[PDB]
């Protein structure tokens, strides 16, 4: 599950990156390229200037913190013997321990509502005015 | 008519009439034959004999029934109701019997 | 192409006269609870069967033109022609019944089973001479008087 | 009108339903606390301010009689405490009417009265006469009873005075050790009083000391005269007695259905009382119509039949030289169904007397067997 | 009196047959020989008579004369007859008679009231059956030709026009007082007609 | 079309297969019962998570058992691909190309040392 | 075996479906007639006239072809494939309905040979024997009292 | 006509049926469905064919076959037959008759 | 043999069957009607405890059942309902519904 | 606890009824006021009249009530069998 959000958090990163740059380079290019005196701006592709090269250290501040996030849940990984074994030695009495306590209970209800079964003959017709 | 004899004999007449049901059940069995012989790929009737079975059995029903009709004599109806319920016999005098038929009593 | 309207009207008349016998026929049954009678049924029964023989008629003298006939539709073709159900209308495909009908069981010494009307012959000279056979006297006993 | 007088006693009948003291035959009172005084005694009654709550009196100073009183309260009080269940509505003040009808008459006429009684000089004789009694017939207490046939007297058994007794119904005989007799027997009485004389043949009150020797030989002086004098006393009966014709030295057929309660007996025995017996005993057997026996009593008694195939019947005249006979027949732990039935032959007059006053002292005590030997039970 | 009458006239040439056919609709079948003695009026004295249409005739059983002959029978009780004609205004029924008639014990108050006003005529002498079933004199007479008059009747030839024994149903009620019970017999009557419409028929005829 | 189906084997004869497999007091009844009903129901209804908690460890050791492998096979993919056409050249600026390299190095670097530690047990 | 469509034909690649470019898929269909006049000049399209444009001139020629007549609800096409060999004497011998994108025909022997065949063999049927019995055979106390008080129930 | 109805049923009924002996044994040339529809032809021929118990009705019950006249009531004259029995036993009664009376004057004590 | 291959061609038919439509392609080939067929097929060494952890498509088991139906066959043999069975909440059902 | 005229009130006849009313000089002659008294006697007879009328329910019929008293008794030791027998129960009971 952890494993799950990561990778896909990681992978829509790239998704991110495609969504923020090309995005900004349709945000035309009013840089000094080496054309002509002709800036380039409408077939080799105003839109926003914020972001040409301002938003290099503009906007990628709003995504810094994003790509950050990913090292959150590195820490929370279960990191401890790969054989796993003893959780399961340790927990297989569970299977029959519940069992056990059950029974008792399990008969439970039924009797002890049959000690009072044992008298709703009784318990039951008393009831004659 | 009675030509030969009178030889009504109406009580035994009915033998006639009770047996005839045979002939008429035959008819099934003289009919059956033709669709048998007619289905297998067989002489036309050297095989069948039974286009004749058939008439022949027929013209004999027609035949006894028509000579039934005529010893027969009562124009349709005639005193319409109830043919006899109109009737009334003897079983005063036979219960009567009893004074002659027991009581030799004394004896 | 004209010529064959008074045709097809024909078989539409006769359609129709088939859907009403039927249409009849249904509410007839309903409108008694049991059986109404056997012989209602028999005529009922033999009614359709007049017009089912017209239909078969009217299909042999002239199937070889039908056979010819390709769609060539007119007066409300190009129009309706969008509702699919015109494949329902052509369904060329047969019913389970019509499949199960078996050629089978009949193939066995097939390919004759014609050249058989000598039976009609017989069966006419046998009904002609029956016809001529009314002599009330002896039922063809042909013996002494009684 | 002369007839005035029976139409005011036509209603000689109290008001009786008690809260209103009105008895008003010249006594003195006051309300609110409704305490009474005479020149005789007084007497106080603390009744609640609806009903009645206690009662007490005074016998205000006689003389000894005055230890007589403290028992007064125990009979009147107890005519007027009601709550045997519950009665607010139901308490007729006749009987207190008729107890305490006694005392006024004797308060209205003293003279400086209820001090000359003679009971205190009568008990000797009653003291003695047991005495006379050293045969032993083993029956410790009957003599008590035994005793009614010469003397007996109380004070204040029953009612709110001095009296006597005669002949108890019984006689002879019991576990019972409740009182149901109590309330069934009728000893009957002898009352005693004071009231004004009129015929100068009487005399009158003598104020006694004794009447009565020191040795019982049954002697009986008197007393003797001059209390500056006197008006003296009467004394009358409980259930009056009708003597016959006699007045010395002061047809019908009808019948009834009964049923009498034999358990187990003698050969055949009687159906009336039990004294039947030892009167009808000539010996051992014998009873072939006596016709003789004695049935003692101060006066005797009279004859005795009986059938054979033995439907019994009977005949008693009275012969105390006065011979007068009737009679009566008799037809057949349960009822038997018998047939009484009573035939008189002759017939005379009978007095029914109720009271006369004596002049002194032996005057009543000399005819209680005249008195005794007049009982004519009759069961009905 | 008061009575519905029908009748309805059939051909001997078929009285075996009829008689047959009308065994059943109970009881065998009584003959009965009769004669009669019409006589007429001369005086016109009539307090309770009316002369004029309602002259007096006389019936007589001759019971035994049937198998005897000759008629002499006064002592069975000859009862005289005087009714009303045929009486018209109805038609859904038939005829209803009034026909006043007694019989006495051999009285010879006939001849007294012949001595009175009348004398005997001619008269005639008929044969019946009588099929009595239920309710409805069910018979079928016939008037053999008597030419004698109160005698034997040796010719006994046929009688009238309807040759033939002429039958007759009659339900006597001489109290019509009662019209829920003439309205009965009427329905009865009815039913009657439609269940043997089926061979006999019957209407007002010519005596 | 569709490949009708190879139904070889059909029939009804098959005896050869089963042949060879022949080889004013009440009050205290009250309260007892409600009290043992209680304190039953509760304890039931309570400590049946147990199956939860176990279906969460062997969850857990599943999905750390091989998984991790596959996350630590598929990371470096990442970034064995993100050097597409990255030269020494300082053709544009591709300034955006340096700055993303040194950014998905540090967390390739994170994660690496983050995986080598993860496996403490042999 | 022309009843019902099958696709062998999954490829749109040939070509754009319109009037220039329909016919390619009859061109490539299940069936081919492999002899026809644009079969023998334009499988030489090589190099050549290649287009609906230049096949529409081939009538010109002597054999046998095709023409379009329909274009029909939204998609409706018909071939009305003809044997024109000789001049001016073509012979049809077959069209084809496109629509659906596969080919269709069917010959009208259907609308009586398919409602015979039902309308006899269903309603034949109904002569099951419905019910048997008759003089021979052609023509078939406390709790019968609880009627006579249904009506009094309600009554009282 | 209670009699000749025998007439307007066995021919029209089963001569109609023989001659449906042609519509099967049609020649067959020209058509495939044909024979879907000539089934139903034979089978109604012979639900027709099987009219028999309308047959059967009109053979027993005839017209009465066990009573045939209009009954008449007439009257027998055979009673005598049981008269003879019944004369014998009159005349013998009166024996036992007699031989009772004799019992009535055969006490005697004193009298004649 | 006429067909090499023998162990997974066994079982990727008996694991085809995972949408309805193909199956009613073969009930309109009628195989079905073939009680060898049917016989046959009541073929389930899939669903006994051994010869199961190899299935891989554990959706195919409900369609076990609804097939040894005997009626539901014809029912299905409807195209319009072997179209109804087209559709099933894999969401919803996150947890196999039966 | 009766709110009616008092027992004592309720005098059932003039305790002097003559009231000393002997005819000769000593006679109550207070005809008309004796008549006053016995009006007052009349009108304390109707106030113990309503009073009466107004005091006791008298149930149904001197009987009837009775009849109910008994129905009512019989109820009531059903009733208390009932308590009794579960309380028997309830201590047969609770044995474990």
Same mark, same amino acid.
């Given at each position: 599950?952890?494993?799950?959000?990561?990778?896909? $958090?990681?992978?829509?990163?790239?998704?991110?990156?495609?969504?923020?740059?090309?995005?900004?380079?349709?945000?035309?290019?009013?840089?000094?390229?080496?054309?002509?005196?002709?800036?380039?701006?409408?077939?080799?592709?105003?839109?926003?200037?914020?972001?040409?090269?301002?938003?290099?250290?503009?906007?990628?501040?709003?995504?810094?913190?994003?790509?950050?996030?990913?090292?959150?849940?590195?820490?929370?990984?279960?990191?401890? *013997?790969?054989?796993?074994?003893?959780?399961?030695?340790?927990?297989?009495?569970?299977?029959?321990?519940?069992?056990?306590?059950?029974?008792?209970?399990?008969?439970?209800?039924?009797?002890?509502?049959?000690?009072?079964?044992?008298?709703?003959?009784?318990?039951?017709?008393?009831?004659?005015? | 008519?009675?030509?030969?004899?009178?030889?009504?004999?109406?009580?035994?007449?009915?033998?006639?009439?009770?047996?005839?049901?045979?002939?008429?059940?035959?008819?099934?069995?003289?009919?059956?034959?033709?669709?048998?012989?007619?289905?297998?790929?067989?002489?036309?009737?050297?095989?069948?004999?039974?286009?004749?079975?058939?008439?022949?059995?027929?013209?004999?029903?027609?035949?006894?029934?028509?000579?039934?009709?005529?010893?027969?004599?009562?124009?349709?109806?005639?005193?319409?109701?109830?043919?006899?319920?109109?009737?009334?016999?003897?079983?005063?005098?036979?219960?009567?019997?009893?004074?002659?038929?027991?009581?030799?009593?004394?004896? | 192409?004209?010529?064959?309207?008074?045709?097809?009207?024909?078989?539409?008349?006769?359609?129709?006269?088939?859907?009403?016998?039927?249409?009849?026929?249904?509410?007839?049954?309903?409108?008694?609870? !049991?059986?109404?009678?056997?012989?209602?049924?028999?005529?009922?029964?033999?009614?359709?069967?007049?017009?089912?023989?017209?239909?078969?008629?009217?299909?042999?003298?002239?199937?070889?033109?039908?056979?010819?006939?390709?769609?060539?539709?007119?007066?409300?073709?190009?129009?309706?022609?969008?509702?699919?159900?015109?494949?329902?209308?052509?369904?060329?495909?047969?019913? !389970?019944?019509?499949?199960?009908?078996?050629?089978?069981?009949?193939?066995?010494?097939?390919?004759?089973?014609?050249?058989?009307?000598?039976?009609?012959?017989?069966?006419?000279?046998?009904?002609?001479?029956?016809?001529?056979?009314?002599?009330?006297?002896?039922?063809?006993?042909?013996?002494?008087?009684? | 009108?002369?007839?005035?007088?029976?139409?005011?006693?036509?209603?000689?009948?109290?008001?009786?339903?008690?809260?209103?003291?009105?008895?008003?035959?010249?006594?003195?009172?006051?309300?609110?606390?409704?305490?009474?005084?005479?020149?005789?005694?007084?007497?106080?009654?603390?009744?609640?301010?609806?009903?009645?709550? =206690?009662?007490? =009196?005074?016998?205000?100073?006689?003389?000894?009689?005055?230890?007589?009183?403290?028992?007064?309260?125990?009979?009147?009080?107890?005519?007027?405490?009601?709550?045997?269940?519950?009665?607010?509505?139901?308490?007729?003040?006749?009987?207190?009417?008729?107890?305490?009808?006694?005392?006024?008459?004797?308060?209205?006429?003293?003279?400086?009265?209820?001090?000359?009684?003679?009971?205190?000089?009568?008990?000797?004789?009653?003291? #003695?006469?047991?005495?006379?009694?050293?045969?032993?017939?083993?029956?410790?207490?009957?003599? *008590?009873?035994?005793?009614?046939?010469?003397?007996?007297?109380?004070?204040?058994?029953?009612?709110?005075?001095?009296?006597?007794?005669?002949?108890?119904?019984?006689?002879?005989?019991?576990?019972?050790?409740?009182?149901?007799?109590?309330?069934?027997?009728?000893?009957?009485?002898?009352?005693?009083?004071?009231? !004004?004389?009129?015929?100068?043949?009487?005399?009158?009150?003598?104020?006694?000391?004794?009447?009565?020797?020191?040795?019982?030989?049954?002697?009986?002086?008197?007393?003797?005269?001059?209390?500056?004098?006197?008006?003296?006393?009467?004394?009358?009966?409980?259930?009056?007695?009708?003597?016959?014709?006699?007045?010395?030295?002061?047809?019908?057929?009808?019948?009834?259905?009964?049923?009498?309660?034999?358990?187990?007996?003698?050969?055949?025995?009687?159906?009336?009382?039990?004294?039947?017996?030892?009167?009808?005993?000539?010996?051992?057997?014998?009873?072939?119509?006596?016709?003789?026996?004695?049935?003692?009593?101060?006066?005797?008694?009279?004859?005795?039949?009986?059938?054979?195939?033995?439907?019994?019947?009977?005949?008693?005249?009275?012969?105390?030289?006065?011979?007068?006979?009737?009679?009566?027949?008799?037809?057949?732990?349960?009822?038997?169904?018998?047939?009484?039935?009573?035939?008189?032959?002759?017939?005379?007059?009978?007095?029914?007397?109720?009271?006369?006053?004596?002049?002194?002292?032996?005057?009543?005590?000399?005819?209680?067997?005249?008195?005794?030997?007049?009982?004519?039970?009759?069961?009905? | 009196?008061?009575?519905?009458?029908?009748?309805?006239?059939?051909? *001997?040439?078929?009285?075996?047959?009829?008689?047959?056919?009308?065994?059943?609709?109970?009881?065998?079948?009584?003959?009965?020989?009769?004669?009669?003695?019409?006589?007429?009026?001369?005086?016109?004295?009539?307090?309770?008579?009316?002369?004029?249409?309602?002259?007096?005739?006389?019936?007589?059983?001759?019971?035994? $004369?049937?198998?005897?002959?000759?008629?002499?029978?006064?002592?069975?009780?000859?009862?005289?007859?005087?009714?009303?004609?045929? !009486?018209?205004?109805?038609?859904?029924?038939?005829?209803?008679?009034?026909?006043?008639?007694?019989?006495?014990?051999?009285?010879?108050?006939?001849?007294?009231?012949?001595?009175?006003?009348?004398?005997?005529?001619?008269?005639?002498?008929?044969?019946?059956?009588?099929?009595?079933?239920?309710?409805?004199?069910?018979?079928?007479?016939?008037?053999?030709?008597?030419?004698?008059?109160?005698?034997?009747?040796?010719?006994?030839?046929?009688?009238?026009?309807?040759?033939? *024994?002429?039958?007759?149903?009659?339900?006597?009620?001489?109290?019509?007082?009662?019209?829920?019970?003439?309205?009965?017999?009427?329905?009865?009557?009815?039913?009657?007609?439609?269940?043997?419409?089926?061979?006999?028929?019957?209407?007002?005829?010519?005596? | 079309?569709?490949?009708?189906?190879?139904?070889? #084997?059909?029939?009804?004869?098959?005896?050869?297969?089963?042949?060879?497999?022949?080889?004013?007091?009440?009050?205290?009844?009250?309260?007892?019962?409600?009290?043992?009903?209680?304190?039953?129901?509760?304890?039931?209804?309570?400590?049946?998570?147990?199956?939860?908690?176990?279906?969460?460890?062997?969850?857990?050791?599943?999905?750390?058992?091989?998984?991790?492998?596959?996350?630590? =096979?598929?990371?470096?993919?990442?970034?064995?691909?993100?050097?597409?056409?990255?030269?020494?050249?300082?053709?544009?600026?591709?300034?955006?190309?340096?700055?993303?390299?040194?950014?998905?190095?540090?967390?390739?670097?994170?994660?690496?040392?983050?995986?080598?530690?993860?496996?403490?047990?042999? | 075996?022309?009843?019902?469509? #099958?696709?062998?034909?999954?490829?749109?690649?040939?070509?754009?479906?319109?009037?220039?470019?329909?016919?390619?898929?009859?061109?490539?269909?299940?069936?081919?007639?492999?002899?026809?006049?644009?079969?023998?000049?334009?499988?030489?399209?090589?190099?050549?006239?290649?287009?609906?444009?230049?096949?529409?001139?081939?009538?010109?020629?002597?054999?046998?072809?095709?023409?379009?007549?329909?274009?029909?609800?939204?998609?409706?096409?018909?071939?009305?494939?003809?044997?024109?060999?000789?001049?001016?004497?073509?012979?049809?011998?077959?069209?084809?309905?496109?629509?659906?994108?596969?080919?269709?025909?069917?010959?009208?022997?259907?609308?009586?040979?398919?409602?015979?065949?039902?309308?006899?063999?269903?309603?034949?049927?109904?002569?099951?024997?419905?019910?048997?019995?008759? =003089?021979?055979? #052609?023509?078939?106390?406390?709790?019968?009292?609880?009627?006579?008080?249904?009506?009094?129930?309600?009554?009282? | 006509?209670?009699?000749?109805?025998?007439?307007?049923?066995?021919?029209?009924?089963?001569?109609?049926?023989?001659?449906?002996?042609?519509?099967?044994?049609?020649?067959?040339?020209?058509?495939?469905?044909?024979?879907?529809?000539?089934?139903? $032809?034979?089978?109604?021929?012979?639900?027709?064919?099987?009219?028999?118990?309308?047959?059967?009705?009109?053979?027993?019950?005839?017209?009465?076959?066990?009573?045939?006249?209009?009954?008449?009531?007439?009257?027998?004259?055979?009673?005598?037959?049981?008269?003879?029995?019944?004369?014998?036993?009159?005349?013998?009664?009166?024996?036992?008759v007699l031989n009772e009376m004799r019992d009535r004057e055969r006490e005697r004590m004193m009298a004649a | 043999h006429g067909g090499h291959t023998r162990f997974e061609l066994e079982l990727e038919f008996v694991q085809a069957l995972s949408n309805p439509e193909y199956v009613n392609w073969l009930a309109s080939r009628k195989y079905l009607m073939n009680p060898a067929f049917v016989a046959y097929l009541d073929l389930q060494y899939w669903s006994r405890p051994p010869y199961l952890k190899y299935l891989t498509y554990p959706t195919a088991l409900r369609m076990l059942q609804l097939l040894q139906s005997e009626r539901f066959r014809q029912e299905i043999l409807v195209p319009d309902v072997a179209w109804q069975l087209r559709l099933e909440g894999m969401k919803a059902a996150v947890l196999w519904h039966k | 606890a009766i709110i009616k005229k008092l027992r004592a009130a309720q005098q059932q006849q003039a305790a002097n009824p003559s009231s000393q009313a002997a005819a000769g000089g000593p006679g109550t002659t207070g005809a008309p006021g004796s008549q006053p008294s016995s009006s007052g006697p009349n009108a304390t007879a109707a106030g113990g009249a309503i009073g009466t009328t107004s005091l006791p329910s008298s149930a149904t019929t001197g009987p009837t009530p009775s009849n109910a008293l008994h129905s009512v008794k019989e109820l009531p030791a059903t009733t208390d069998p009932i308590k009794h027998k579960l309380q028997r129960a309830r201590a047969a009971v609770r044995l474990l």
């Amino acid at each position: 599950d952890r494993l799950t959000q990561l990778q896909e $958090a990681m992978d829509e990163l790239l998704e991110m990156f495609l969504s923020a740059f090309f995005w900004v380079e349709r945000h035309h290019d009013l840089k000094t390229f080496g054309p002509n005196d002709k800036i380039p701006d409408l077939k080799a592709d105003t839109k926003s200037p914020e972001e040409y090269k301002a938003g290099q250290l503009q906007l990628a501040r709003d995504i810094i913190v994003k790509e950050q996030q990913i090292e959150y849940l590195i820490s929370t990984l279960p990191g401890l *013997d790969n054989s796993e074994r003893e959780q399961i030695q340790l927990l297989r009495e569970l299977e029959d321990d519940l069992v056990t306590a059950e029974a008792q209970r399990q008969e439970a209800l039924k009797e002890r509502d049959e000690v009072l079964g044992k008298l709703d003959a009784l318990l039951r017709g008393l009831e004659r005015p | 008519p009675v030509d030969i004899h009178k030889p009504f004999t109406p009580a035994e007449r009915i033998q006639q009439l009770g047996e005839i049901d045979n002939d008429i059940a035959s008819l099934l069995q003289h009919l059956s034959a033709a669709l048998k012989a007619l289905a297998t790929p067989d002489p036309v009737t050297a095989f069948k004999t039974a286009q004749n079975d058939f008439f022949r059995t027929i013209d004999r029903i027609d035949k006894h029934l028509t000579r039934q009709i005529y010893a027969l004599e009562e124009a349709g109806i005639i005193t319409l109701k109830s043919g006899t319920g109109s009737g009334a016999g003897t079983v005063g005098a036979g219960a009567t019997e009893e004074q002659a038929q027991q009581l030799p009593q004394p004896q | 192409a004209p010529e064959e309207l008074k045709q097809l009207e024909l078989l539409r008349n006769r359609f129709a006269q088939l859907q009403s016998s039927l249409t009849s026929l249904a509410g007839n049954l309903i409108r008694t609870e !049991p059986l109404p009678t056997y012989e209602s049924l028999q005529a009922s029964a033999s009614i359709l069967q007049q017009n089912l023989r017209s239909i078969q008629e009217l299909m042999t003298e002239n199937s070889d033109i039908f056979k010819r006939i390709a769609i060539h539709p007119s007066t409300n073709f190009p129009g309706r022609t969008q509702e699919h159900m015109l494949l329902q209308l052509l369904r060329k495909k047969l019913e !389970p019944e019509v499949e199960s009908w078996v050629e089978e069981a009949r193939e066995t010494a097939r390919a004759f089973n014609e050249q058989w009307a000598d039976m009609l012959e017989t069966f006419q000279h046998s009904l002609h001479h029956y016809v001529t056979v009314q002599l009330k006297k002896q039922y063809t006993v042909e013996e002494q008087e009684m | 009108e002369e007839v005035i007088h029976i139409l005011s006693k036509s209603k000689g009948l109290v008001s009786e339903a008690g809260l209103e003291r009105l008895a008003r035959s010249l006594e003195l009172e006051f309300m609110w606390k409704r305490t009474l005084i005479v020149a005789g005694s007084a007497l106080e009654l603390l009744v609640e301010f609806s009903q009645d709550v =206690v009662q007490s =009196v005074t016998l205000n100073f006689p003389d000894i009689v005055t230890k007589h009183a403290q028992k007064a309260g125990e009979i009147l009080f107890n005519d007027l405490r009601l709550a045997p269940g519950q009665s607010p509505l139901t308490k007729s003040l006749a009987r207190f009417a008729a107890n305490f009808e006694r005392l006024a008459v004797l308060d209205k006429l003293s003279i400086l009265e209820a001090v000359a009684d003679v009971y205190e000089s009568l008990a000797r004789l009653h003291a #003695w006469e047991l005495q006379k009694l050293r045969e032993d017939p083993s029956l410790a207490g009957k003599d *008590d009873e035994y005793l009614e046939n010469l003397v007996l007297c109380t004070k204040s058994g029953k009612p709110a005075m001095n009296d006597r007794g005669r002949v108890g119904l019984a006689l002879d005989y019991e576990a019972e050790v409740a009182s149901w007799i109590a309330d069934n027997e009728r000893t009957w009485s002898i009352l005693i009083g004071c009231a !004004p004389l009129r015929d100068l043949s009487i005399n009158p009150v003598r104020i006694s000391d004794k009447w009565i020797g020191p040795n019982v030989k049954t002697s009986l002086p008197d007393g003797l005269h001059t209390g500056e004098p006197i008006i003296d006393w009467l004394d009358p009966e409980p259930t009056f007695i009708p003597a016959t014709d006699q007045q010395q030295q002061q047809p019908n057929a009808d019948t009834t259905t009964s049923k009498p309660t034999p358990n187990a007996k003698a050969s055949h025995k009687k159906l009336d009382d039990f004294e039947a017996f030892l009167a009808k005993h000539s010996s051992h057997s014998g009873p072939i119509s006596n016709m003789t026996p004695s049935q003692h009593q101060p006066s005797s008694d009279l004859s005795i039949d009986v059938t054979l195939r033995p439907k019994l019947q009977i005949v008693f005249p009275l012969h105390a030289t006065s011979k007068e006979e009737v009679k009566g027949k008799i037809a057949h732990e349960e009822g038997d169904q018998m047939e009484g039935v009573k035939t008189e032959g002759d017939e005379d007059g009978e007095e029914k007397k109720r009271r006369r006053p004596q002049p002194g002292d032996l005057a009543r005590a000399l005819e209680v067997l005249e008195d005794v030997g007049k009982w004519a039970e009759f069961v009905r | 009196p008061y009575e519905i009458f029908l009748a309805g006239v059939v051909s *001997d040439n078929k009285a075996r047959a009829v008689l047959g056919g009308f065994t059943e609709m109970i009881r065998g079948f009584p003959t009965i020989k009769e004669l009669l003695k019409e006589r007429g009026p001369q005086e016109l004295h009539n307090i309770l008579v009316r002369q004029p249409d309602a002259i007096l005739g006389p019936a007589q059983a001759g019971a035994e $004369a049937a198998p005897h002959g000759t008629v002499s029978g006064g002592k069975p009780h000859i009862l005289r007859w005087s009714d009303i004609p045929d !009486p018209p205004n109805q038609r859904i029924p038939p005829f209803i008679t009034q026909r006043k008639i007694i019989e006495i014990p051999d009285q010879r108050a006939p001849r007294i009231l012949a001595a009175s006003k009348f004398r005997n005529k001619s008269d005639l002498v008929e044969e019946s059956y009588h099929w009595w079933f239920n309710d409805v004199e069910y018979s079928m007479v016939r008037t053999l030709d008597p030419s004698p008059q109160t005698t034997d009747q040796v010719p006994s030839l046929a009688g009238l026009e309807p040759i033939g *024994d002429f039958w007759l149903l009659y339900v006597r009620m001489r109290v019509e007082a009662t019209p829920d019970r003439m309205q009965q017999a009427h329905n009865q009557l009815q039913q009657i007609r439609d269940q043997l419409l089926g061979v006999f028929e019957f209407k007002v005829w010519d005596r | 079309l569709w490949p009708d189906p190879p139904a070889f #084997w059909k029939p009804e004869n098959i005896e050869r297969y089963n042949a060879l497999k022949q080889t004013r007091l009440a009050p205290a009844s009250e309260t007892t019962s409600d009290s043992k009903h209680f304190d039953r129901g509760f304890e039931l209804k309570k400590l049946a998570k147990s199956l939860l908690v176990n279906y969460l460890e062997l969850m857990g050791i599943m999905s750390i058992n091989p998984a991790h492998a596959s996350e630590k =096979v598929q990371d470096i993919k990442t970034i064995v691909l993100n050097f597409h056409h990255i030269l020494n050249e300082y053709i544009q600026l591709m300034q955006d190309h340096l700055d993303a390299k040194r950014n998905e190095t540090a967390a390739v670097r994170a994660v690496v040392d983050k995986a080598k530690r993860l496996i403490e047990g042999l | 075996l022309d009843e019902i469509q #099958w696709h062998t034909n999954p490829a749109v690649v040939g070509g754009s479906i319109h009037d220039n470019s329909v016919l390619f898929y009859f061109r490539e269909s299940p069936f081919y007639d492999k002899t026809s006049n644009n079969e023998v000049l334009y499988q030489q399209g090589l190099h050549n006239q290649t287009m609906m444009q230049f096949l529409e001139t081939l009538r010109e020629m002597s054999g046998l072809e095709f023409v379009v007549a329909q274009e029909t609800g939204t998609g409706v096409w018909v071939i009305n494939k003809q044997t024109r060999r000789k001049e001016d004497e073509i012979s049809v011998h077959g069209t084809y309905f496109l629509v659906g994108e596969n080919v269709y025909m069917a010959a009208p022997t259907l609308a009586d040979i398919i409602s015979m065949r039902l309308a006899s063999a269903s309603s034949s049927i109904s002569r099951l024997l419905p019910i048997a019995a008759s =003089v021979q055979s #052609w023509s078939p106390p406390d709790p019968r009292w609880l009627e006579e008080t249904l009506m009094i129930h309600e009554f009282f | 006509e209670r009699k000749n109805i025998l007439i307007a049923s066995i021919m029209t009924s089963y001569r109609d049926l023989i001659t449906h002996a042609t519509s099967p044994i049609t020649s067959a040339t020209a058509s495939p469905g044909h024979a879907g529809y000539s089934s139903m $032809a034979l089978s109604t021929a012979i639900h027709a064919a099987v009219k028999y118990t309308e047959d059967l009705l009109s053979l027993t019950r005839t017209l009465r076959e066990a009573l045939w006249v209009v009954g008449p009531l007439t009257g027998p004259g055979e009673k005598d037959a049981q008269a003879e029995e019944g004369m014998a036993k009159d005349a013998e009664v009166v024996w036992d008759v007699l031989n009772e009376m004799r019992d009535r004057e055969r006490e005697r004590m004193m009298a004649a | 043999h006429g067909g090499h291959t023998r162990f997974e061609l066994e079982l990727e038919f008996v694991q085809a069957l995972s949408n309805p439509e193909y199956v009613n392609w073969l009930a309109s080939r009628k195989y079905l009607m073939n009680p060898a067929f049917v016989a046959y097929l009541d073929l389930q060494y899939w669903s006994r405890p051994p010869y199961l952890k190899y299935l891989t498509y554990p959706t195919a088991l409900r369609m076990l059942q609804l097939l040894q139906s005997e009626r539901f066959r014809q029912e299905i043999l409807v195209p319009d309902v072997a179209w109804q069975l087209r559709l099933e909440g894999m969401k919803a059902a996150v947890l196999w519904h039966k | 606890a009766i709110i009616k005229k008092l027992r004592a009130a309720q005098q059932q006849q003039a305790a002097n009824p003559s009231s000393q009313a002997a005819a000769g000089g000593p006679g109550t002659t207070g005809a008309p006021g004796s008549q006053p008294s016995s009006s007052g006697p009349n009108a304390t007879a109707a106030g113990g009249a309503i009073g009466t009328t107004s005091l006791p329910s008298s149930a149904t019929t001197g009987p009837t009530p009775s009849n109910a008293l008994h129905s009512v008794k019989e109820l009531p030791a059903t009733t208390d069998p009932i308590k009794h027998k579960l309380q028997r129960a309830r201590a047969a009971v609770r044995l474990l």
